[PDB]
Symmetry: C5
Subunit: 327 residues, 5 copies
């Protein structure tokens, strides 16, 4: 906000009614009123002042701090003691640079009255949640904040996967509408890479959601148990779609390979025809007589009765190999 | 019926004895008599008035309404509270357009005394159930309606799979009856696509049926537990048939690829023969004498004793490479 | 027997001591004495009078009758109520027509004092059991009849699988005894089809036997529990042999494909040699002098000092490409 | 021993202290003293007198006798009643004939005070155990005899697998030390066959050992429970090594196939070069002038200004296709 | 230390506060004070005096001694009695020789107050732990020593796997940045070998860590239960990365094979073009007239009206096969 900010991207105190207020860098001195309003803090994991405040503030165990300030992580849920669970989520990387896969990683520390979220590269889901909040229809408690974040991450991953599916649909309909048209490589490769890199991170998030759906009594009240369950369902459906997409890509690749091999065989057949017709014919014409037509007026060759038997032999060979080429 | 209908395809109050009656758009004022007769409503999921009535009528939780008015779904059973389970089923798409796979989706909300079914594209199973009903031999309670719908969906999926099997049988018997005959591509591809798209939706329905068969005490009385079990069995058998069909298609594809590769090798062999016979022979005839037979009457060549040794060398080379080509 | 029979193939009342007696079509009026003797009925599932009697006689639930008069089934065991289990078994189809796989289906309804068996195509196991019975050493109770049927079905499936194994052994020993000999296709294909079609039905029968072996206290007394267990073992062993046979067939196929590809490469090498030796040599001889030896007695060419440098260039090219072909 | 023996290979009464004594064919009249010494009998499963004595002696249930006198078996453990378990083990076939895989089968009937072992083809492990015994350091009870047999069978299977691994190591180091050197086929094939045939029988023995390790309280006192456990471990390690060996063989095969395909492409490239250089050049020289150098002293051709434009066209074609061949 | 050492690499008595002291070969006479300080001994498994002392000292069961002085082992945890567990770990082999895979094996015997570690080839993790210790910030109890060893082994295995990933990234970005550039073989092969040899040993260590994380109450106090759990997590992540790396390598290999096959087809097409254009044209020029231009001034050929029809036939053939080659 006004003045320079150390590491705090979005400092927003909730309201308990979907509303809220931004607090900015002067948040160590907030006195939250009766416990309906949570407090949300979005931190830049790269800025060293963020890690500084994160080490000594809001009383996090040094184990926890070291657990969400790592470099490489995989999606997982982690409960540490009567409160304070840790969730490691993966965005979908709609950054101006590239690569929808290679998913941005979002790390959440969920308390009963605080949520602290970490990221390196900006996420869309967080801006969605923010504009949701100041619109007066956002979440109202910590569990609701985590649910909104997960919901938006999934609402974008499924959009991406449906886009991949329509891309494959266009490729296929083009390939089969035309004929002897190869599918555009360097696109099937990118789609395969994308499906693999998506599954690699979506497989553990489904389990995160399943775990968040089963009991999680005190933290994330079962009011949202079925919501977490249907998020689990949506990721299951998306993984099914990913496997179907991979199998469709493999079918396209096998079809293309078979096509080029059959075309190879066809051109080899034509090559054999061209040779076997002309190589002998160019040899038998070797001992042929005068190569100009009708030397003595009526009939060009004279004395042919001796050696003319050769034109029959190469003709027999030709028709033999021709029947030998057909079958 | 008479007058214009908002979204209600089939409004049919059951009878408890297989009979029933159609009610039409004036159904908010039905007073069902003593509880033997259910009430069935088939809605068009696309018409906005259907979703309008569905939001505020028959007292469905907003969660439920939002759960069966989605766009993309996968087959699953869902129990929500002492009553009112939700089933998401997949037809087989016998629509005039195309594609037996890409299965029509049927979504059922089953109560103890009401069934509400949703669809976008028309389904055969529903017309089957209707003509069954007004024939006086249809279902008589809600569980029976859901069972009839599932039974008809399966009675058509197995017909489709047996059709696929006979198609593969015809293809194979043709291929092996003839010889060097390639199987009709663009048909093996469609059959493979069909098997994959069928399995993608049949794998969860088997689990739906298994779940509906295990306890489901209060809702779907165990009178039909064994019926749901045998529906589970039939889908298991059909999935086995689908895997067998996929493996048969893969065998046909490998056979065709091997055939074209071996034919490629054969035509390359013939090409090598044609060249290795004539390329040397066309070279040794280069320094040959007069290309017309018997110049000095008796014997055509003169002075051959010097350079005639060459015709032996290329002949040795020819028989060498010929023995080198055979083995 | 004497007189015309409606649908009853083998009507044989057991004895409790392995013996028995045939009853024929007049069996509705048998009064079985003190309960040591069962009653066996082998029915033709196709004859409509068999299904007629089967609907209303021996008091079978209409669900049961409809369950074993289906068209397509998979092997499974099915218990229905304090008695009366249903077993669906698969023979091995030693019929004069064809196809050891595509196994004949045998459907058994086992009671405490009755066995009713159904089939379309004749089975060997049943004739085995019959000739066993009238020999005085057959079964003596219902469980024993079902066990004998299963035992004979397995005694024939393992014979078939061992035959397949010896066939593969002969094929392999021929292929490796000789060299550059392709395995007989259209036989590897049939063996692969046979293994697949056998496994498709043997996988559920193993589970049938396991289930029949675990408790089945009242029906099939544990006197035969270990016998059912060893039948389970034998089918497990046969499935292991089937997987081993499939892997051996795949090894043979890969060996053949590698062989034809390497032969293809070899003939391409020979083709390149034939061309690269003669194509240049046939070109350099183009500007060669008189193609007859020793024109001016001593040395054929005159004035060669100008253009004779060319015979070195094509020779350098030849030895270059020859060294380029070797490595 | 002295006199002729019916079927008893090794008749050795143990001692309880690792020692013992051979008894020979006169063993029906041994009166074992206070129960520290077991009694071991190694029988030839082929000799009919062995099966004769085995049917009626040492009081084995006819079920048991029929269970270990079968023809085809798979490795399994089998407990039958308060005593008397049955183990079916597989040797490694170090017989002078051939085939380390195709493992000799050893069948053990273990009592609390008797061990009876059956075999067709001689086993090394048994001679090991014998020379161990008369050395004064052999087993002392029945469980110890079975453990020694299993221990020796494993000590030889792992030797064989390590030999396979070093063979693959030598093959690989040769292949990569040299270049364009194909791996010795007919050896990779034997190693693959060997790994498959070893796994086929080692997979169930691991389970035999695991079962023998879990409780087996009364029979095989838990004094050896951890020993059976580490035997389980050793077979697990050997199966891991077998899978690694199979994957290494597959890598070698793919490398060889890629190598021959790339060499095929290379020789095709050289063939295309040889033709495309000389086929046009041999055609343009067709209408060339006098093929001898310098006819009118200074410059050989006369009147070339009309048709000399052709030598440019085929040169353009040549450089075109040459650039078309490179890229 | 000073004087010659028999087999003891690192003899270091801990301190209970991260500190400690080296003891050297005179350690049989240490009297550890009140039980906060453990005692660590790193032994060379090859030196026979190490195995000598290890057989009779620190009171290890002969079973244990024989269990960790084996030759071939796989990673596993092993508890033997109220104390004294055995862990078999695998380093990453950063030895000057070669092969990051083929991992050095570290074998630990963990007591409540003693740790005894064995190795053949030197390990980095142990030097790390040592320099950690004498820096005053090392472990302080036995469980902490085992945890530090495992932590360092993992901190190096993940470094190696990330290096493999960046190597593949460089290879891919090169391949796709350029075009028709083959990936560097003999590097993809080494990376595949490395991934396989890493997984072969990392799969059991993950289970070691999971087991060490679940209860292990008395030995390895649950103070480190979550630490062992996150070590389990890190190995799970690394195995995921290994599978992703293998799939990326397979994609690169398939892309290269497709590229060489398509280039093969392209050069075959060019070869067919070169022949089919010139082979006929070189034949029709056979009977062509004078090969010098304009013999009678105005028009070179005379009498062509008879046989000139041939130049049309070979031209028709040429354009036919050309259209036959395109499609």
């Amino acid at each position: 906000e006004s003045g320079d900010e150390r590491g705090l991207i979005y400092g927003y105190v909730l309201n308990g009614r979907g509303g809220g207020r931004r607090v900015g860098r002067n948040q160590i001195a907030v006195l939250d009123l009766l416990p309906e309003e949570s407090l949300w803090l979005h931190w830049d994991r790269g800025v060293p002042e963020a890690q500084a405040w994160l080490r000594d503030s809001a009383g996090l165990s040094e184990f926890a701090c070291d657990l969400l300030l790592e470099e490489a992580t995989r999606p997982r849920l982690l409960d540490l003691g009567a409160e304070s669970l840790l969730v490691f989520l993966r965005g979908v990387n709609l950054n101006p640079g590239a690569e929808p896969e290679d998913m941005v990683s979002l790390r959440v520390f969920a308390d009963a009255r605080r949520v602290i979220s970490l990221r390196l590269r900006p996420l869309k889901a967080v801006a969605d949640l923010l504009e949701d909040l100041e619109a007066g229809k956002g979440p109202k408690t910590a569990s609701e904040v985590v649910y909104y974040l997960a919901h938006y991450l999934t609402d974008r991953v499924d959009t991406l996967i449906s886009g991949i599916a329509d891309q494959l649909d266009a490729v296929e309909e083009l390939v089969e509408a035309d004929e002897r048209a190869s599918p555009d490589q360097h696109q099937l490769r990118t789609l395969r890479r994308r499906s693999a890199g998506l599954r690699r991170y979506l497989a553990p998030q489904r389990d995160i959601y399943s775990q968040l759906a089963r009991y999680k009594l005190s933290w994330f009240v079962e009011d949202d148990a079925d919501y977490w369950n249907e998020l689990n369902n949506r990721l299951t459906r998306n993984l099914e779609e990913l496997e179907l997409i991979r199998e469709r890509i493999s079918v396209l690749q096998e079809a293309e390979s078979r096509r080029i091999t059959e075309r190879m065989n066809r051109t080899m057949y034509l090559l054999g025809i061209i040779t076997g017709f002309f190589l002998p014919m160019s040899f038998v014409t070797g001992l042929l007589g005068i190569n100009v037509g009708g030397i003595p007026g009526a009939d060009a060759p004279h004395g042919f009765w001796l050696a003319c038997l050769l034109i029959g032999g190469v003709a027999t060979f030709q028709w033999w190999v021709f029947r030998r080429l057909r079958w």
